[PDB]
UniProtKB/Swiss-Prot annotation, chain A:
Protein's UniProt name: Protein FeSII
Disruption phenotype: No visible growth phenotype, but shortly after entry into stationary phase the nitrogenase subunitsare destabilized and are no longer detectable. In vitro nitrogenase is highly sensitive to O(2).
Segments of this protein annotated with the region N-loop: 56-93
Species per Swiss-Prot/TrEMBL record: Azotobacter vinelandii
Cellular location(s): Cytoplasm
Family: Belongs to the adrenodoxin/putidaredoxin family.
Swiss-Prot record, chain B:
Gene from which the chain derives: fesII
Residues binding [2Fe-2S] cluster, per UniProt: 41, 46, 49, 101
Species of the source: Azotobacter vinelandii
Residue ranges of domain 2Fe-2S ferredoxin-type in the record: 1-118
Protein name: Protein FeSII
Induction: Expressed in nitrogen-fixing and non-nitrogen-fixing cells, although transcript levels are higher in nitrogen-fixing cells. Expressed during log and stationary phase growth (at protein level). The gene is monocistronic.
Length: 116, 118
């Protein structure tokens, strides 16, 4: 698993190869990436990260082509929420708490403001 | 993968053992096992093979691994969109509507429902 860490407080992004252990925060701290860690109960929100999934499904769980979405819409089997979710122009980022995020086999771009 | 086919036109559901393949479709599995899902086009544009799929194993809400606590913390900092909140707050296992001729059989166990109407 390849993780690219990025922050306005880092002049260079950091490419990290991660192995089984494990949280995003744990991986970051182990590799000198200073994601703010301000609680031991996962309630403060200081470790907030913006994650872009680099490989795998573009929209997680949404394997539908434009054609299938149109066919499903025509029979009233495509909810507006699912339509809008798939119609996103730019690769959708997910906000997570790094102290709660388990490192999987997925390649990620991990962004954080650097502010406490 | 285990697939359970169910329809108002079938007095009994049909449990099927299928093999995951990049070219293997839900409709192909159904036809091979005598499950009469309507098949009316070769282009995936007619909508006859419409199925309601319940993912029996794996992630409850595909791509959402967030705990209730994390969802609450993210909401408090305005980093949980209303659409993602409602999607995770669903009380019943969320069913997905698909065209069986377009659905690729993976390792995931499924409940596959269809009306039986052409
Ligand atoms: S360090 Fe407090 S929520 Fe992650
Ligand atoms: S058979 Fe026509 S959409 Fe599947």
């Amino acid at each position: 698993a390849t993780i690219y860490f990025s922050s306005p407080l880092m002049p260079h992004n950091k490419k990290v190869q991660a192995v089984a252990g494990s949280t995003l925060l744990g991986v970051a701290q182990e590799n000198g990436v200073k994601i703010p860690f301000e609680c031991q109960d996962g309630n403060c929100g200081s470790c907030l990260v913006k994650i872009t999934h680099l490989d795998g499904e573009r929209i997680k769980g949404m394997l539908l082509t434009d054609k299938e979405r149109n066919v499903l819409k025509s029979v009233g089997k495509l909810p507006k929420s699912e339509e809008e979710r798939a119609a996103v122009r730019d690769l959708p980022p997910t906000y997570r708490l790094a102290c709660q995020t388990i490192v999987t086999d997925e390649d990620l771009l991990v962004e954080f403001t650097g502010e406490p």
